[PDB]
Amino acid sequence: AKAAAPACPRFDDPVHAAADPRVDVERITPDPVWRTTCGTLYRSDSRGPAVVFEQGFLPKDVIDGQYDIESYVLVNQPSPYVSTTYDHDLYKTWYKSGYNYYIDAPGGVDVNKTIGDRHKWADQVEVAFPGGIRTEFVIGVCPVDKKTRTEKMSECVGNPHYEPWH
């Protein structure tokens, strides 16, 4: 080294990653701009890793939840989406969610590419996964010390179910 990074694998299925494949891609509004990069993404969640490593990240409701992205972002009501972020540090902004999960998953809807980078929550730099995220795409987790908003890095854990794909 040094070395330039290679380009990403592209699955034909825009919801390849989905933990709940009943999600209906045609109902997504507006027209989604899918993420085509393959960097690590993150998610603050208060749910613990015993659960997330077994189940993945399941969406609250693929059947009757809020398929409109702008609505889902602005009002946060049960949806077919699991939100993640490009920003490793967004956990510092979360009220008291426990853990910073590390994700290596193809696809997702890029929220700012889809709805623009001017809405109220644009600095969350979100990627919304319709159908969620299977366990094989969850790398691991670091617990968060809440009073300093830092990761407890000697307490990070790998997901035994993680399956590297690139």
From TrEMBL:
Span of domain Pierisin-like: 41-162
Positions that bind NADH: R43, S44, S46, L58, K60, Y72, N76, E126
Disulfide bond entries: C8-C38, C142-C156
Keyword annotations: Nucleotide-binding, Signal
Origin superkingdom: Bacteria
GO MF, any single term: nucleotide binding
Keyword Transmembrane in record: no
Name listed for the protein in its UniProt record: Putative secreted protein
UniProt source species: Streptomyces scabiei (strain 87.22)
